Short mmCIF file of C-alpha atoms in Angstrom, two decimals:
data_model
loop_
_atom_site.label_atom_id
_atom_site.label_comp_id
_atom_site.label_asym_id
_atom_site.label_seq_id
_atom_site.Cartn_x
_atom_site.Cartn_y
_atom_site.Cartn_z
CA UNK R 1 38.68 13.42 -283.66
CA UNK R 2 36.73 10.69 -281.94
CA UNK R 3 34.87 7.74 -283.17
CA UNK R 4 31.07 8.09 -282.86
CA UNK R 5 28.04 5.49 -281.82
CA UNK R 6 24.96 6.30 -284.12
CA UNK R 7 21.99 5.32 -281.30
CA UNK R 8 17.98 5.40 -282.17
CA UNK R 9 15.67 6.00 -279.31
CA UNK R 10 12.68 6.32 -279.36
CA UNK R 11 9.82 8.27 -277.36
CA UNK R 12 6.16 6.68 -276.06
CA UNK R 13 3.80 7.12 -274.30
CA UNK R 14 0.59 8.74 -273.58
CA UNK R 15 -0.72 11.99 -276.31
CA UNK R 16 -0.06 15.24 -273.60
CA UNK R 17 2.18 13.06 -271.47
CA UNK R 18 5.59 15.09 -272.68
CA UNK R 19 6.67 13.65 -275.85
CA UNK R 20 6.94 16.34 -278.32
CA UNK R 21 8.56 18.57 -275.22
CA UNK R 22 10.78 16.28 -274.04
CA UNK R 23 11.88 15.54 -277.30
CA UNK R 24 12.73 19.56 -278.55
CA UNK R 25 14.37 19.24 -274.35
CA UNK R 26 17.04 16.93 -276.01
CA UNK R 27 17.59 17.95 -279.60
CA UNK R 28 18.20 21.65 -278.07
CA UNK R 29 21.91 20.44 -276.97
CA UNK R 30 12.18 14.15 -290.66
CA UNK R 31 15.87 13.86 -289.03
CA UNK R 32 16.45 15.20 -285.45
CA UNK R 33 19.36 14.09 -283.66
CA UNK R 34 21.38 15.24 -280.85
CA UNK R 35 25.07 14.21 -279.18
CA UNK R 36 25.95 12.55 -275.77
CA UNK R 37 29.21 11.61 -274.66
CA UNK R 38 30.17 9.60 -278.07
CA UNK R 39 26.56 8.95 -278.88
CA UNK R 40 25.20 10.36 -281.94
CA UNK R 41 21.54 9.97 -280.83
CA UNK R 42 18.52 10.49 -283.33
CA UNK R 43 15.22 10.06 -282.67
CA UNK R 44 12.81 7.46 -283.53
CA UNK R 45 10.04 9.44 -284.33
CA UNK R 46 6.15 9.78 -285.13
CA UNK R 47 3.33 11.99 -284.75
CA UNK R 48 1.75 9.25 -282.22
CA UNK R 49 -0.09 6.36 -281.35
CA UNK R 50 -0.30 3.69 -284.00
CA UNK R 51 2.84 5.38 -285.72
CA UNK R 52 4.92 4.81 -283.04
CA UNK R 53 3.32 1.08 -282.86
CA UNK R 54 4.61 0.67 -286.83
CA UNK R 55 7.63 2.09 -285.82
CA UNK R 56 8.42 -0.74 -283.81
CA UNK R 57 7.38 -3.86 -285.14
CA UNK R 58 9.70 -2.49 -288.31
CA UNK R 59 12.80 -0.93 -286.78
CA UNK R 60 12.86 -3.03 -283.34
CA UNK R 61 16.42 -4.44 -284.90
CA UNK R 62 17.94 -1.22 -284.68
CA UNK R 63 16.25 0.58 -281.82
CA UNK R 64 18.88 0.86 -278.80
CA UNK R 65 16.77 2.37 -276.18
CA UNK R 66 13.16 3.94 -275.42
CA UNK R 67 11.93 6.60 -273.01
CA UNK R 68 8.23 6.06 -272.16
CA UNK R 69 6.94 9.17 -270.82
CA UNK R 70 4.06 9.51 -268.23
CA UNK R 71 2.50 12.55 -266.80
CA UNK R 72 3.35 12.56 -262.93
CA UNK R 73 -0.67 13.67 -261.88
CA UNK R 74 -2.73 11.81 -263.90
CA UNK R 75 -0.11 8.43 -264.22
CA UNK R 76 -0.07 5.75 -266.77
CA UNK R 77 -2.93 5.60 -268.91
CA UNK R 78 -4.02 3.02 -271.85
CA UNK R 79 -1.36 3.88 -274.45
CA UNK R 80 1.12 3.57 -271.84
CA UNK R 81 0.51 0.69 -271.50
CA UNK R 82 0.61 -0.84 -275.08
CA UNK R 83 3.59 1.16 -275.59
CA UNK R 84 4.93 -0.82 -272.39
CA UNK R 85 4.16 -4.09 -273.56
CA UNK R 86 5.38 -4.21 -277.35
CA UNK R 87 8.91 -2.64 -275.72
CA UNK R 88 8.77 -5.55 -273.43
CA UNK R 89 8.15 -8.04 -276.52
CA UNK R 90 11.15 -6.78 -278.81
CA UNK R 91 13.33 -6.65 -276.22
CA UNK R 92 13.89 -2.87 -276.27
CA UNK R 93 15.23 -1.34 -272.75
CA UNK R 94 13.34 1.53 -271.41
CA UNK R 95 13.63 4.38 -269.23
CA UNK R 96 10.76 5.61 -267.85
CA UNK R 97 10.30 9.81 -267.68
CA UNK R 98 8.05 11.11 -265.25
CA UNK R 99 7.02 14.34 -267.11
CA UNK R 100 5.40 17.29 -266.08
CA UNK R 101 7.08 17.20 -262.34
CA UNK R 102 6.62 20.62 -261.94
CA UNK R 103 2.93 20.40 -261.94
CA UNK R 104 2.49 18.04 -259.23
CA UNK R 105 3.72 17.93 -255.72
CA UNK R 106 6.38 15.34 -254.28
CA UNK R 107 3.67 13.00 -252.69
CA UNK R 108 1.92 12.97 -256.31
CA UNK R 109 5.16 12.28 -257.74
CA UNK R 110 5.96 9.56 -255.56
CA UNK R 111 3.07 8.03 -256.09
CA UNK R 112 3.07 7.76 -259.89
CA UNK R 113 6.88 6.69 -259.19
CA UNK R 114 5.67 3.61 -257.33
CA UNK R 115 2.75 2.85 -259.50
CA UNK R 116 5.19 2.58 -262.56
CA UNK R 117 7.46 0.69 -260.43
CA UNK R 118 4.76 -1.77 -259.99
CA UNK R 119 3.89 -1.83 -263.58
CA UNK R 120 7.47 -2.56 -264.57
CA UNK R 121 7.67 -5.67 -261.90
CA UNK R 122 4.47 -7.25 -264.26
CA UNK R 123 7.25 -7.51 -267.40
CA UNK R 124 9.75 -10.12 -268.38
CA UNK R 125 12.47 -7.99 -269.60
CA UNK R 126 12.03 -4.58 -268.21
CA UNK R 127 11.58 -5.75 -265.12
CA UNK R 128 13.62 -3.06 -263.32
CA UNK R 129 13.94 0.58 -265.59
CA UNK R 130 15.09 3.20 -263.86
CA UNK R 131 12.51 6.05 -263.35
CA UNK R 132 12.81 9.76 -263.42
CA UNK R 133 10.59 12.45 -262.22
CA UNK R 134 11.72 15.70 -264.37
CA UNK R 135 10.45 19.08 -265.88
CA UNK R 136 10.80 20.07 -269.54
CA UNK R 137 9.97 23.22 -268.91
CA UNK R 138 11.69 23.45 -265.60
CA UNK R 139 15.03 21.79 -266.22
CA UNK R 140 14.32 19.59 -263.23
CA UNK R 141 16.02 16.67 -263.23
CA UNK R 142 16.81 16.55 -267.15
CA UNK R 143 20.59 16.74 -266.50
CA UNK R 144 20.04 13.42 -264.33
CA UNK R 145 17.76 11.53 -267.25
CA UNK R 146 21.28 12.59 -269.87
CA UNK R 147 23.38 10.55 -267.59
CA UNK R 148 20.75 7.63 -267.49
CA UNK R 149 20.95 7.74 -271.62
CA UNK R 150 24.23 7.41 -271.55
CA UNK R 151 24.87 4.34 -268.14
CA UNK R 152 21.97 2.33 -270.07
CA UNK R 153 23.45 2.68 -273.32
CA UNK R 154 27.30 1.91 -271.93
CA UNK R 155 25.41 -1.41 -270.72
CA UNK R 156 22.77 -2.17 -273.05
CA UNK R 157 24.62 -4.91 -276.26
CA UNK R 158 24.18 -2.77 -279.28
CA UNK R 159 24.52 -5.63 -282.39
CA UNK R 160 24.37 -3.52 -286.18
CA UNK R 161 24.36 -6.42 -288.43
CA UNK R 162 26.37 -5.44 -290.98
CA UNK R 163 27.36 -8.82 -292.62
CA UNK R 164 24.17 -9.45 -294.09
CA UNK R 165 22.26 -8.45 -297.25
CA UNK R 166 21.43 -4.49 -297.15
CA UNK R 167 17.69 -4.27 -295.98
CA UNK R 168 16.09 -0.59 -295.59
CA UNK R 169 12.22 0.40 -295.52
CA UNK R 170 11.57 3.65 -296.57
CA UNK R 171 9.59 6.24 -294.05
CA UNK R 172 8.93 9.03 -296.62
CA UNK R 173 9.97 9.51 -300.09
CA UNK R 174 9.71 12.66 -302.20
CA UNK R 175 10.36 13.54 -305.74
CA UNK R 176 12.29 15.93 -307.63
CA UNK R 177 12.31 15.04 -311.32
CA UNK R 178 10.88 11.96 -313.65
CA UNK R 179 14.74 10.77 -313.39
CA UNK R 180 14.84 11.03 -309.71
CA UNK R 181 13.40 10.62 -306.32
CA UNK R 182 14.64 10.76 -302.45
CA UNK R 183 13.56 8.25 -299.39
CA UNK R 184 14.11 8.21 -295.77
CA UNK R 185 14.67 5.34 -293.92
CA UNK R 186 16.98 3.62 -291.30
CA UNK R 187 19.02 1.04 -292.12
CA UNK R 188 18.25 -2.16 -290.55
CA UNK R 189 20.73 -4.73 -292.26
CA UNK R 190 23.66 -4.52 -294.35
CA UNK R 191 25.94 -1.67 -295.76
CA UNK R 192 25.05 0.76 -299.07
CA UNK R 193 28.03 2.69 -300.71
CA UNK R 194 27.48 5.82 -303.17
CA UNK R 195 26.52 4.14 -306.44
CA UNK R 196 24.99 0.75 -305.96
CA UNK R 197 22.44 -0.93 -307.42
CA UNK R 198 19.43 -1.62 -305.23
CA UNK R 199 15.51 -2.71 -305.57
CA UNK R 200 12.62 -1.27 -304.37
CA UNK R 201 10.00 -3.27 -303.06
CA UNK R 202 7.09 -4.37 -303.30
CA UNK R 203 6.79 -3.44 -306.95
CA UNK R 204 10.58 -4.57 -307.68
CA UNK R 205 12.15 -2.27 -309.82
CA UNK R 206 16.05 -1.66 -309.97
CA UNK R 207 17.71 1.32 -309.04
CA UNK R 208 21.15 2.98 -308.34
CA UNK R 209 22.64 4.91 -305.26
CA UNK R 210 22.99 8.62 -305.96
CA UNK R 211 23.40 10.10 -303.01
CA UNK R 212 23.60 9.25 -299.08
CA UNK R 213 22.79 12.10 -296.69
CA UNK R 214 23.62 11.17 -292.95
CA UNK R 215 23.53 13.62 -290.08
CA UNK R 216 23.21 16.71 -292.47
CA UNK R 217 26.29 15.18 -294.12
CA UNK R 218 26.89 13.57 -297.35
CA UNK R 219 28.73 10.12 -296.78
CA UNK R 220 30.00 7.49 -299.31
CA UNK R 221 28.96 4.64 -297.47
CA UNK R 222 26.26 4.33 -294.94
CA UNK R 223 25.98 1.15 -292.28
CA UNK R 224 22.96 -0.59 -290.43
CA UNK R 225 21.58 1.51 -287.58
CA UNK R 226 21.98 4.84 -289.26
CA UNK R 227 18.95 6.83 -290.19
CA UNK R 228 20.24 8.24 -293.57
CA UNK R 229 18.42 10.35 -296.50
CA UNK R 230 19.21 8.88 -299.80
CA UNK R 231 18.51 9.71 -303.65
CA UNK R 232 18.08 7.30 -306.24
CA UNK R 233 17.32 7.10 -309.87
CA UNK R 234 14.73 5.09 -311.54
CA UNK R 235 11.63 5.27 -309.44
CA UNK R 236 9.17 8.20 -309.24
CA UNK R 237 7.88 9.21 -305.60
CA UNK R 238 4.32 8.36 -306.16
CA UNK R 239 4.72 4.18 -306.60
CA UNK R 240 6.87 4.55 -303.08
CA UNK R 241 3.92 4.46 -299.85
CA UNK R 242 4.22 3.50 -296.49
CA UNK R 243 4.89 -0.20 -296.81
CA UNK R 244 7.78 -0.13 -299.50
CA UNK R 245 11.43 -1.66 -298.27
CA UNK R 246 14.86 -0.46 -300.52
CA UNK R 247 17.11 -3.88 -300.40
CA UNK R 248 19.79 -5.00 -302.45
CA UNK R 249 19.91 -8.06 -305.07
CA UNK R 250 20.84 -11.20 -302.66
CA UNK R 251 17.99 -10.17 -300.35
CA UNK R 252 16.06 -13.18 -298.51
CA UNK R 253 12.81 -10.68 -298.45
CA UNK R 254 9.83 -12.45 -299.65
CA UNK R 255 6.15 -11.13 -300.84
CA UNK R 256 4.26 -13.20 -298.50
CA UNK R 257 0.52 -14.33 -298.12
CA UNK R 258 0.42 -17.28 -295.79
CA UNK R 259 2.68 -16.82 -292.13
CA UNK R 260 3.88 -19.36 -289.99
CA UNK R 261 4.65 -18.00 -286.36
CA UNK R 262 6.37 -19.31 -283.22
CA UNK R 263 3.65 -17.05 -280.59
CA UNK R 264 4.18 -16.02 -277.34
CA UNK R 265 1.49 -14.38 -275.65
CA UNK R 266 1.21 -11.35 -273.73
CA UNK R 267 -1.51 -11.67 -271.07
CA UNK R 268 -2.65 -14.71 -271.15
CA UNK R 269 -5.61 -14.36 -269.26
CA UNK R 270 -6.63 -11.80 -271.78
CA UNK R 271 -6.01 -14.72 -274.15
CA UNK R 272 -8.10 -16.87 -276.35
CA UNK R 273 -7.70 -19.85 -278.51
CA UNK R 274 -10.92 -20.66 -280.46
CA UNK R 275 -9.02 -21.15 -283.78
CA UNK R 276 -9.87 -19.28 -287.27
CA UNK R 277 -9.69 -15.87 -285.63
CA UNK R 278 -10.00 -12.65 -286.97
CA UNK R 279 -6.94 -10.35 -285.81
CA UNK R 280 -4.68 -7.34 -287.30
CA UNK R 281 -1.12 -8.68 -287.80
CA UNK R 282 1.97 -6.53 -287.45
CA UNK R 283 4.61 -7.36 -290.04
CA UNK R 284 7.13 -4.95 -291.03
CA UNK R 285 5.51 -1.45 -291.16
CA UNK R 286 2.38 -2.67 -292.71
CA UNK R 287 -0.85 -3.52 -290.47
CA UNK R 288 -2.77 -6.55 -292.12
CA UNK R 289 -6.20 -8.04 -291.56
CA UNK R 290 -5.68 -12.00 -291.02
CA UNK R 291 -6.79 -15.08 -289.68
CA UNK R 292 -5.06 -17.40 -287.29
CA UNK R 293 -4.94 -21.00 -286.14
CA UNK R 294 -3.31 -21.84 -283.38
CA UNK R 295 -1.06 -25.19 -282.47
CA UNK R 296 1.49 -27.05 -281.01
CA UNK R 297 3.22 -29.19 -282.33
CA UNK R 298 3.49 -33.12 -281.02
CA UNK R 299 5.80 -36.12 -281.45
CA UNK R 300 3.95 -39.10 -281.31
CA UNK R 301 7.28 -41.52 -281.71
CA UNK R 302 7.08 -41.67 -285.17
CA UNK R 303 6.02 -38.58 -286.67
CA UNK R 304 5.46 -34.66 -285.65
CA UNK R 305 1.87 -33.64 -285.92
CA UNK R 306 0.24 -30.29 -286.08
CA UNK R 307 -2.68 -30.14 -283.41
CA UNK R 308 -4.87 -27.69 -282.80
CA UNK R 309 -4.26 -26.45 -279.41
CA UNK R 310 -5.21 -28.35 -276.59
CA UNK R 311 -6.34 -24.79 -275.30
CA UNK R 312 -3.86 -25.74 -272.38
CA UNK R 313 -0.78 -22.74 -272.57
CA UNK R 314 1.35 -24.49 -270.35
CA UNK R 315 4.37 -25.58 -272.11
CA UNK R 316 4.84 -22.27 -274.18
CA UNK R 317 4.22 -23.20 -277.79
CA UNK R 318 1.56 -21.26 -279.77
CA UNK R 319 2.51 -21.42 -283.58
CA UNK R 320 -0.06 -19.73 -284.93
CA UNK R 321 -0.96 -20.46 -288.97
CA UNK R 322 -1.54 -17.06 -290.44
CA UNK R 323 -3.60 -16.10 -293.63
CA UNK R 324 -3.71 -12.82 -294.39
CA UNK R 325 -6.13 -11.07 -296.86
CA UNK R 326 -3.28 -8.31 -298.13
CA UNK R 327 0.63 -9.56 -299.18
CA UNK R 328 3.22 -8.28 -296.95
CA UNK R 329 7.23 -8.39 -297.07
CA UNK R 330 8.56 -11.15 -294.17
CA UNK R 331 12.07 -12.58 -294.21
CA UNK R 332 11.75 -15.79 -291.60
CA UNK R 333 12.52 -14.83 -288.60
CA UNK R 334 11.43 -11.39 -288.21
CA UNK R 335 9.30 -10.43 -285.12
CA UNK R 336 5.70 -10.42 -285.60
CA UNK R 337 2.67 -8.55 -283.48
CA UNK R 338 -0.56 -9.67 -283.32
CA UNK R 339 -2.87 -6.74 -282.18
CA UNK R 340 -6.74 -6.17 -282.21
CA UNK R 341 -6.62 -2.49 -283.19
CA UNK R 342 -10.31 -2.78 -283.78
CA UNK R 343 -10.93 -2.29 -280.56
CA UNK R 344 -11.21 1.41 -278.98
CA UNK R 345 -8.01 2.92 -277.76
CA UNK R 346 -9.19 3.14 -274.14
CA UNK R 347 -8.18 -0.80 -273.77
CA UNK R 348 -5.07 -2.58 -274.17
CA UNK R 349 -4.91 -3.75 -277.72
CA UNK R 350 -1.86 -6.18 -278.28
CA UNK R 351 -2.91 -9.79 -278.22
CA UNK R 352 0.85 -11.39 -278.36
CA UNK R 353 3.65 -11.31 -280.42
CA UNK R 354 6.18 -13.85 -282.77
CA UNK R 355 8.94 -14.92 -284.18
CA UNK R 356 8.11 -15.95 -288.15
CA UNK R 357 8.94 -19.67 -288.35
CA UNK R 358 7.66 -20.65 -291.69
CA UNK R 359 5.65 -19.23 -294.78
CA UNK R 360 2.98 -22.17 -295.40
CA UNK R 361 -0.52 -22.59 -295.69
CA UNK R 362 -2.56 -24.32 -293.13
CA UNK R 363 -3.43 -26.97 -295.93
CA UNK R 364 0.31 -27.89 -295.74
CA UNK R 365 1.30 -28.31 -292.63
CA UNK R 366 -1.68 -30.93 -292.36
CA UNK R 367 -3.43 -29.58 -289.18
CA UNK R 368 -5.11 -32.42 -286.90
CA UNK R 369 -7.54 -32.45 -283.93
CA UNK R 370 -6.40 -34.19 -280.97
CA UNK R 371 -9.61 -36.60 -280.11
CA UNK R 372 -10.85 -37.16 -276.46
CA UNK R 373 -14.52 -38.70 -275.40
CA UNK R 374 -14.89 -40.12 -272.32
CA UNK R 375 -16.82 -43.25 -270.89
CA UNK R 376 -17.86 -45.04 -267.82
CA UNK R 377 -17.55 -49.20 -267.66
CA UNK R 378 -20.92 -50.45 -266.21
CA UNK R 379 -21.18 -54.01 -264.72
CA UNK R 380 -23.88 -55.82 -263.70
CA UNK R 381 -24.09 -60.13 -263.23
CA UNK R 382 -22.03 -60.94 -266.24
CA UNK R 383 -21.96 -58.36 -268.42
CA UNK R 384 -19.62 -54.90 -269.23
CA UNK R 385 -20.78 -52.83 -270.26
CA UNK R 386 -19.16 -49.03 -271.39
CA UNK R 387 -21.29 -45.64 -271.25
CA UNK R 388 -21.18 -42.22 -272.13
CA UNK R 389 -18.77 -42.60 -275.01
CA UNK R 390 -21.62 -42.76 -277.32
CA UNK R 391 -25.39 -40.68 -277.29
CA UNK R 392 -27.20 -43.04 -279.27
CA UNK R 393 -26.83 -46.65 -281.12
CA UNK R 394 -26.26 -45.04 -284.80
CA UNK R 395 -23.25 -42.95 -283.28
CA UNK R 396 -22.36 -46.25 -281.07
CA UNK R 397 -22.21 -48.46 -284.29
CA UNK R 398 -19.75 -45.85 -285.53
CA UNK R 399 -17.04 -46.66 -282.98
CA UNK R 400 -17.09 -50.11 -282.84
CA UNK R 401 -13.93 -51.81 -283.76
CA UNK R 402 -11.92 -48.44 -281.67
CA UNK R 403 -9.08 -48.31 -279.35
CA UNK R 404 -10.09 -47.95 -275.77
CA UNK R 405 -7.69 -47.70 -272.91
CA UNK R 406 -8.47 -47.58 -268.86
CA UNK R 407 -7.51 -44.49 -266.89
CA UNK R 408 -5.00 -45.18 -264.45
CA UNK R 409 -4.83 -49.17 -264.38
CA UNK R 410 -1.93 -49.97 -267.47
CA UNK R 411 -4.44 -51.93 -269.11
CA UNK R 412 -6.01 -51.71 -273.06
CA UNK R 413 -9.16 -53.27 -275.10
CA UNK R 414 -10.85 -52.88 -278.41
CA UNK R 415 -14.76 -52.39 -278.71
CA UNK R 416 -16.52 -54.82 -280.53
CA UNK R 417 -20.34 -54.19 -280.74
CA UNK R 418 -23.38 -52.14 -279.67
CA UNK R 419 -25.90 -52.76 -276.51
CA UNK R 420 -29.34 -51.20 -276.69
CA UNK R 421 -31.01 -48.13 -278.12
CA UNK R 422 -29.18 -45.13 -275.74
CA UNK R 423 -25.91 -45.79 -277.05
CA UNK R 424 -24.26 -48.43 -275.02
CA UNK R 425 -21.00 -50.22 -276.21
CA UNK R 426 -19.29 -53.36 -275.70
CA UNK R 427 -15.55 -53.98 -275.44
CA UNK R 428 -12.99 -56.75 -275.22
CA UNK R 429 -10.22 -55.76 -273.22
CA UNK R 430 -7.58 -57.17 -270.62
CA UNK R 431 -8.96 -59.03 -267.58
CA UNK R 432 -9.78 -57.51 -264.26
CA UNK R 433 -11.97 -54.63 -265.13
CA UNK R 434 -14.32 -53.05 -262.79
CA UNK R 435 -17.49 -51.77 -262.52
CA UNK R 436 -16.85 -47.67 -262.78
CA UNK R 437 -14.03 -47.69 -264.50
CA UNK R 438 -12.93 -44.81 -266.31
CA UNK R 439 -12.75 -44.95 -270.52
CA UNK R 440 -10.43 -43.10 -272.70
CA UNK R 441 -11.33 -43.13 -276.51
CA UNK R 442 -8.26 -42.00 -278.13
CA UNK R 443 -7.68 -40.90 -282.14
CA UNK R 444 -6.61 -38.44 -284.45
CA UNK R 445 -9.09 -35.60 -286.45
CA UNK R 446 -8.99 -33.75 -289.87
CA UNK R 447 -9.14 -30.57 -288.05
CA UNK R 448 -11.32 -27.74 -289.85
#
């Protein structure tokens, strides 16, 4: 017959917005899947809102599209939002459902329309998503939001990566024997064929491939993007939890402690960079207490240094050192999300996201503080005389012999000695200096 397209999509939004109705809406026509066109479409599913959230940062690869539903009365609320912005960050395209039209009026609907449409303008890559008022359990308008499935996935660049190494984390996993066990997952990277030999992970043991259940199907081979069941020998279901990942023997997966990220921010005005902070970080499917130092890093002409931000965000880099307190599994390059999940659900919890550069310590990468005080030059008959870059003569006498430079005027000096008890300095520089000049003390800190 014809070739099939296997398609995840997933469904956010708000708890009593429409998901789970919506959902049964679509599967009508664990594993629940349904067909359109070519499209063998299964959902991306979990009970809710920080599910949904692990769902993402893990299987953001091989998620093709999203629907992010919001009731047409009441609008967006707070975990529309978040939902909103990690889409956004993993580049996942969206349609946005309007659910529950048949409860609210068309000037009600309209309004939540335009409010959304607002919303979607604030985003960098789903800047315009089409929008859909319908009713689950009217009918309205859910022919309409098939065809949309189908025009955004025609358009949308679906990439499996089959090339590389076979890569899988396991959703649930449930035994049947001591010689046996079955896990769920979708397959991110890679191909698996009936009778391989694979490794679970983190506690690395070595299995084999007995069988692959796809679509209520068995299959001899399975390929990255499908959602498959599969049954293999040598691990009991109780040392397989949330966090473990089924990947063959070339893998590039890692048990890391220390993470080096390449972060962009989400709102930056929600933003803050006071260094050593205390955040949740998103790697894989796990959710990780950690501590993070942010950075840029600068060419000097000779060398690259690592410097603690300059707390200025413009220019966009914001590698962030990462330490985290449990292990995770991290291949470099995956997408990671920094949230504060601490924080009650009634405000927007994701404070940026990453791509993983490097796995190294802070003590490595030999962090520095860029070094800035600022003085005045003072002049009277005779004598110069530069103030303010020291409080007192102990901390003056500690500076002397520095490189100075004038603000503005090309020009540079060295400071030789101290003047008086209140912290005075004195400097030879260039000629042609001038009383209120401006003094920039300029060197380079062992940061932390």
């Amino acid at each position: 017959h014809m070739d099939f397209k296997n398609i995840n999509l997933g469904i956010f939004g708000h708890i009593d917005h429409g998901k789970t109705t919506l959902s049964k809406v679509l599967t009508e026509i664990g594993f629940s899947a349904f067909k359109l066109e070519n499209y063998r479409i299964t959902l991306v599913d979990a009970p809710g809102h920080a599910d949904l959230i692990r769902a993402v940062v893990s299987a953001a690869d091989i998620i093709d599209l999203a629907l992010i539903v919001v009731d047409a009365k009441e609008g967006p609320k707070t975990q529309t939002g978040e939902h909103m912005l990690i889409l956004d960050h993993f580049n996942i395209p969206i349609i946005v459902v309007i659910t529950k039209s048949d409860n609210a009026g068309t000037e009600e609907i309209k309004r939540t329309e335009m409010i959304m449409k607002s919303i979607l303008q604030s985003t960098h890559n789903l800047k315009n998503s089409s929008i859909i008022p319908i009713s689950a359990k009217t009918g309205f308008g859910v022919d309409e939001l098939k065809n949309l499935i189908i025009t955004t996935l025609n358009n949308a660049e679906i990439i499996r990566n089959t090339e590389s190494y076979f890569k899988m984390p396991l959703d649930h996993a449930f035994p049947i024997k001591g010689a046996g066990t079955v896990v769920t997952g979708t397959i991110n990277k890679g191909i698996v064929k009936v009778g391989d030999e694979l490794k679970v992970l983190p506690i690395n043991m070595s299995t084999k491939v007995r069988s692959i259940q796809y679509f209520k199907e068995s299959v001899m081979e399975a390929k990255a993007g499908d959602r498959v069941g599969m049954a293999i020998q040598g691990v009991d279901a109780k040392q397989i939890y949330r966090g473990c990942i089924l990947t063959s023997k070339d893998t590039k997966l890692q048990t890391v402690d220390k993470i080096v990220a390449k972060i962009k921010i989400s709102d930056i005005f929600k933003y803050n960079l006071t260094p050593k902070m205390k955040v949740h970080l998103n790697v894989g499917m796990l959710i990780v207490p950690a501590v993070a130092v942010p950075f840029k890093k600068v060419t000097f002409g000779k060398t690259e240094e690592n410097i603690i931000l300059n707390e200025v965000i413009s220019g966009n880099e914001c590698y962030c050192a990462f330490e985290l307190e449990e292990k995770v599994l991290a291949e470099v390059g995956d997408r990671v999300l920094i949230t504060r999940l601490d924080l009650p659900p009634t405000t927007l919890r994701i404070c940026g996201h990453g791509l993983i550069e490097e796995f190294k310590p802070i003590k490595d990468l030999n962090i520095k503080k860029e070094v800035l005080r600022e003085g005045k030059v003072k002049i009277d008959k005779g004598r110069t005389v530069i103030d303010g870059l020291a409080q007192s003569k102990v901390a003056a006498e500690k500076l002397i012999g520095e490189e100075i430079s004038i603000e503005g005027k090309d020009i540079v000096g060295k400071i030789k000695g101290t003047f008086g008890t209140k912290g005075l300095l004195t400097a030879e520089f260039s000629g042609n200096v001038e009383n209120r000049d401006k003094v920039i003390l300029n060197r380079l800190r062992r940061w932390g």
